[PDB]
Design a protein around this ligand. Structure first.
Ligand code: ZN
Lengths: 240, 50, 107, 175, 59, 182, 49, 49, 99, 111
């Protein structure tokens, strides 16, 4: 609460670990001096005098992507110079963390369909200039095909049963070849009549039917029951 | 034997050792062929069959 | 630089030997050599929620070592555990040997 | 003012990277055991089951005169969805024109079919990989080697033609 | 070895007998010493200590 | 030389500008790198003698197995090569084909003897020292690296007196007696 | 323990030094002697080397 | 017979926390931290084929 | 400790010589010069020493307990492998006796 | 000794051989030499192969083949006494003749 930690770079570029007696997943802060959803911050004094730059604690119980990172994903494609198309930017909770992982030289297109989350997205994208908020339905990528061009990773935190079609449409429009496709699958929101392994197997089969080769899946179990992140790459020719 | 001079002696002893070792030794390990390339071993076989 | 590593060189030892600071904490087995690039930072608990994680102005310190030294339960545990490790480590070495010899000699 | 122990410079086969055998100039990965599993129970699978078939299971079904979906249904007493992967189908087609009956019994609209994405038609590799990835599958097989692989990986029920009907082993709720 | 015998006649009666310490170090009594009476010289497997007791198991 | 593409590497497979089949895997180069051999033709000058030993050993094993001519000459050649030091054991006659080897004749050279006698820290140091003229066998100074040291003649490999190396080892243990110059 | 009683595989307790012979402390028994002897033997082995 | 299966199921579901990672119920209070460590080298995710 | 005699250790090879450094009897200038800090610094030194010896003794306890674990796992594992190999060498003789 | 001269097939590199031992491959029109090796037996002739990157020298008896910087790549156990070497560049053949009455064509690519 007023304690001191040591910041250390993670394996993943752009994200850090603060070691204390409990260690924290941590990102750099793109808009220093305020918190976005009430997370705690770490202010280092890096060395004209030294400047107080600061860092934000990524909460795995309020972020599926942070639950995936600290469960252990072999490769995120969200990287410090990239372009990420966030689908289902339900508020600015995880989009802020993706935004400042991606950095000032990279772009996050935050697509959301509801309007009060869109108002909060625009007021957050003021102080984070590398966020392009797009208030539109992701089920029709042509309605915003003019605003986005050639993303490097898609992240999908939509919670709809037509998820794989939404992911496939947005990837075929805006993702480049051998780009990243990170999916957060929620079993109960896809369908609850079958079990979680059946719906994860069906969603992975749908991805490879829409030619996205899955590299890796992770259940992210201590933070969410019956969730998954599937990390794939957009192969576009030859999953074989 | 005690009167058999060179190449007869080497091939005679080798034939005896092959015939003794073909009982208990494995059939994929007793008679190892000399490594000859394909296009000259096949020509060797064709001229020998001729 | 080494000039700053010679100032944070003690709490990096505390983070390296985390596993024997509290007898109930029991971390997962990593090694954690000192990373090549690091930064020492202070947690800002904001002005939204009070009294739960709040370490007040009167007890904020400047290292992890001063907090661990100000903890009085940890001082009890470290002194007790060190005395029992000490009397295990000097169990039969040299004071025992010469008091055995003096036991032989006294009669 | 020369140097001592002067040698002729030759190439070093141990060192020179211009030749081919010297062209060879960490993050661990321990995959977690599945949250579908208890110790060896596989608490998550529930009817309607889905069963991956392979070629000798189909051949033994036709040799023992068992229907596929009806044999599965009266084996498990549940509603089954049988799945022919494209590699099992490739293997049945490669079996030749002796096995036409087996091929056009595998061509059945009641038997759904998956789409494997790899090179080659090794159905045992494909079935083993896609079952140890997901643990939501019953494997119906009669290969001795595939039966040993599947019953060594945990939480995977195994079905097999035995006698005049199908049997199931590692599914702990059959009655 | 000091006191399991009272006389050199007794040790002479018992020469060559196998003894052992309580550590299981086997040994043998060899000859009675002359001036201290029941004291004798024994040879052991290796160096016994001053905190040991030798034992002649008889019946 | 440019890391051929797939169609090129498929179309010209036997192309190799460094390793040929007449090279025999560059083993002259390999063992002359191991034992630090100056001139290029010492490997092949030793290979001729290994071929002499193995040619005689073949032609001598092709005699009948019990006659005293074969047994006498096999034992006599075995004794001669063990005494010279090329062979390390005079027991079995398969050493006369298997264990007779340019590396064995090269391990008997003077710097390798030196390095095994701990008289120099490496074979290149031993080469430098006997080129600089520090090492005598018997009384007489030996000046060239290729000198082959038999088993009875390795008892007399020492340094010359008035050697700076002899002086510094004696003065390291401060056993230097300056009466006999070192 | 297939055909053994638990009243049969009891615990035999070990004896102490005699109180008359008490200034030479701790009558040592076979585990103490083997701890002595193998230490002596490894030190003699490295001395011989 | 009932208390034995009560106490070998408690043992089993304490062993299950070792093999998997069990969903305990979410975030209890304030997010304190990981409380046990973060490994940046280990990736515990199932790779495909 | 192993007390190698001086007559042996003066006649040892150069690689095998025993680096035994003598104690210092003179109050040298760098030792009489060098400053140590007090109060909070000496209790910091005491604290860091206590923490480091508790960590080292905990690690030694853990690795000794793992040694005691894995020797008995080795024992039961070798028993199970011996039973397995006995079963294999009788099943092979069954197979060949039938064929 | 007297220097046998040789130019590369475009005139960029020069390869000289002394009779005594001195073989130097060089870029004669810059001031860049890339091999100066003193092979103390009597060399007779040399030639480039397909480049300045490999050259073959005819030594006391055996023909040797050296890379761009002068490390020995090959000692040819045939080509017993060469006095004349010439490369055939469209056929990749090193042709060798000399004191023996024999003419030897050696494929440089396969070996
Ligand atoms: Zn397949």
């Amino acid at each position: 609460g007023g304690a001191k930690v040591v910041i250390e770079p993670h394996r993943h570029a752009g994200v850090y670990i603060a070691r204390g007696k409990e260690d924290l997943l941590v990102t750099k802060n793109m808009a220093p001096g305020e918190s976005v959803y009430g997370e705690k911050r770490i202010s280092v004094e890096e060395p004209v005098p030294p400047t107080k730059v600061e860092y934000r604690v990524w909460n795995p119980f309020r972020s599926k992507l942070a639950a995936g990172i600290m469960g252990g994903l072999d490769e995120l494609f969200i990287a410090p110079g990239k372009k990420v198309l966030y689908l289902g930017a339900a508020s600015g909770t995880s989009v802020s963390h993706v935004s400042d992982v991606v950095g000032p030289e990279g772009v996050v297109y935050a697509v959301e369909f509801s309007h009060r989350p869109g108002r909060e997205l625009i007021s957050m994208a003021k102080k984070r200039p590398n966020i392009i908020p797009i208030i539109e339905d992701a089920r029709h990528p042509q309605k915003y095909r003019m605003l986005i061009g050639m993303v490097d990773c898609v992240f999908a935190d939509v919670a709809q049963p037509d998820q794989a079609r939404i992911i496939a449409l947005n990837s075929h429009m805006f993702l480049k070849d051998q780009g990243g496709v990170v999916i957060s699958i929620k079993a109960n929101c896809i369908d609850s009549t079958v079990d979680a392994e059946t719906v994860f197997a069906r969603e992975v089969q749908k991805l490879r039917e829409e030619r996205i080769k899955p590299l890796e899946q992770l259940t992210l179990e201590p933070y969410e029951r019956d969730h998954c992140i599937v990390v794939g790459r957009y192969m576009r020719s030859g999953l074989k | 034997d005690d009167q058999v001079i060179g190449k007869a002696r080497s091939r005679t002893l080798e034939m005896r050792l092959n015939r003794l070792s073909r009982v208990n030794g494995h059939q994929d390990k007793i008679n190892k062929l000399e490594k000859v390339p394909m296009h000259i071993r096949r020509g060797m076989i064709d001229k020998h069959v001729k | 630089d080494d000039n700053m590593r010679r100032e944070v060189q003690r709490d990096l030892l505390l983070i390296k030997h985390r596993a024997a600071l509290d007898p109930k904490r029991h971390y997962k087995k990593q090694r954690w050599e000192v990373p090549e690039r690091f930064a020492i930072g202070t947690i800002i608990e904001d002005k939204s929620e009070f009294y739960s994680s709040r370490m007040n102005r009167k007890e904020r310190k400047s290292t992890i070592l001063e907090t661990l030294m100000g903890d009085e339960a940890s001082n009890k545990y470290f002194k007790r555990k060190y005395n029992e490790i000490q009397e295990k480590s000097t169990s039969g070495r040299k004071a025992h040997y010469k008091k055995m010899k003096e036991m032989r000699k006294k009669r | 003012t020369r140097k001592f122990g002067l040698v002729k410079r030759t190439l070093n086969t141990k060192k020179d990277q211009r030749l081919k055998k010297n062209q060879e100039n960490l993050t661990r990965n321990i995959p977690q055991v599945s949250s579908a599993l208890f110790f060896q129970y596989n608490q998550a699978i529930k009817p309607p089951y889905q069963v991956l078939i392979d070629t000798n299971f189909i051949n033994f079904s036709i040799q023992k005169k068992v229907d596929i979906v009806r044999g599965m249904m009266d084996c498990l007493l549940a509603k089954c969805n049988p799945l022919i992967t494209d590699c099992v189908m490739a293997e049945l087609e490669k079996l030749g024109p002796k096995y036409r009956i087996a091929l056009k019994l595998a061509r059945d609209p009641r038997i759904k079919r998956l789409s494997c994405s790899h090179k080659g038609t090794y159905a045992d590799d494909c079935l083993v990989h896609r079952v140890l990835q997901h643990k939501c599958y019953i494997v119906a097989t009669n290969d001795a080697g595939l039966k040993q692989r599947i019953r060594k990986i945990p939480g995977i029920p195994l079905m097999s033609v035995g006698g005049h009907a199908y049997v199931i082993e590692k599914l702990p709720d059959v009655f | 070895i000091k006191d399991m015998f009272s006389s050199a006649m007794e040790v002479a009666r018992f020469e060559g007998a196998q003894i052992k310490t309580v550590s299981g170090i086997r040994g043998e009594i060899k000859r009675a010493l002359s001036k201290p009476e029941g004291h004798y010289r024994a040879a052991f497997e290796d160096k016994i200590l001053m905190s040991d007791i030798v034992i002649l198991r008889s019946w | 030389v440019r890391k051929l593409k797939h169609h090129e590497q498929k179309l010209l497979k036997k192309v190799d500008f460094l390793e040929w089949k007449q090279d025999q895997g560059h083993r002259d180069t390999q063992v002359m790198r191991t034992y630090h051999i100056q001139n290029r033709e010492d490997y092949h000058k030793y290979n001729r003698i290994c071929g002499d030993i193995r040619r005689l050993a073949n032609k001598l094993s092709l005699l009948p197995p019990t006659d005293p001519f074969r047994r006498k000459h096999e034992q006599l050649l075995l004794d001669k090569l063990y005494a010279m030091g090329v062979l390390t054991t005079k027991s079995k006659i398969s050493d006369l084909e298997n264990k007779v080897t340019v590396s064995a004749i090269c391990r008997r050279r003077l710097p390798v003897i030196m390095h095994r006698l701990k008289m120099a820290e490496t074979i290149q140091d031993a080469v430098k020292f006997i080129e600089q003229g520090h090492v005598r066998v018997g009384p007489n100074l030996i000046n060239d690296p290729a000198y082959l040291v038999t088993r009875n003649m390795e008892d007399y490999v020492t340094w010359v007196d008035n050697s700076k190396i002899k002086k510094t080892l004696l003065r390291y243990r401060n056993q230097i007696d300056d009466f006999d110059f070192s | 323990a297939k055909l053994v009683h638990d009243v049969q595989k009891k615990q035999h307790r070990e004896r102490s030094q005699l109180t008359s012979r008490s200034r030479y402390g701790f009558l040592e028994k076979h585990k103490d002697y083997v701890k002595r002897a193998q230490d002596f033997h490894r030190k003699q082995s490295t001395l011989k080397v | 017979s009932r208390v034995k299966k009560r106490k070998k199921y408690q043992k089993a579901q304490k062993k299950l926390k070792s093999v998997r990672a069990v969903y305990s119920g979410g975030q209890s209070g304030v997010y304190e931290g990981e409380k046990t460590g973060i490994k940046k080298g280990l990736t515990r995710s199932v790779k495909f084929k | 400790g192993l007390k190698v005699p001086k007559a042996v250790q003066k006649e040892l090879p150069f690689k095998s010589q025993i680096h035994q450094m003598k104690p210092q009897k003179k109050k040298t200038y760098m030792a009489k010069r060098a400053v140590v800090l007090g109060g909070d610094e000496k209790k910091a030194r005491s604290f860091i020493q206590k923490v480091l010896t508790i960590s080292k003794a905990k690690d030694s306890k853990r690795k000794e307990q793992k040694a005691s674990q894995r020797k008995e796992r080795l024992k039961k594992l070798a028993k199970m492998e011996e039973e397995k190999s006995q079963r294999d060498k009788e099943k092979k003789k069954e197979y060949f006796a039938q064929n | 000794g007297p220097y046998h001269i040789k130019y590369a097939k475009n005139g960029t590199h020069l390869l000289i051989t002394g009779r005594k031992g001195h073989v130097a491959s060089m870029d004669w029109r810059k001031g860049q030499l890339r091999a100066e090796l003193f092979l103390n037996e009597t060399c007779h002739s040399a030639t480039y192969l397909q480049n300045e990157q490999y050259f073959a020298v005819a030594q006391k008896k055996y023909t040797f083949i050296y890379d761009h910087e002068g490390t020995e790549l090959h000692r040819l156990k045939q080509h017993i006494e060469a006095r004349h070497l010439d490369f055939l560049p469209y056929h990749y053949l090193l042709v060798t003749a000399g004191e023996t009455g024999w003419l030897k064509y050696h494929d440089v690519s396969t070996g």
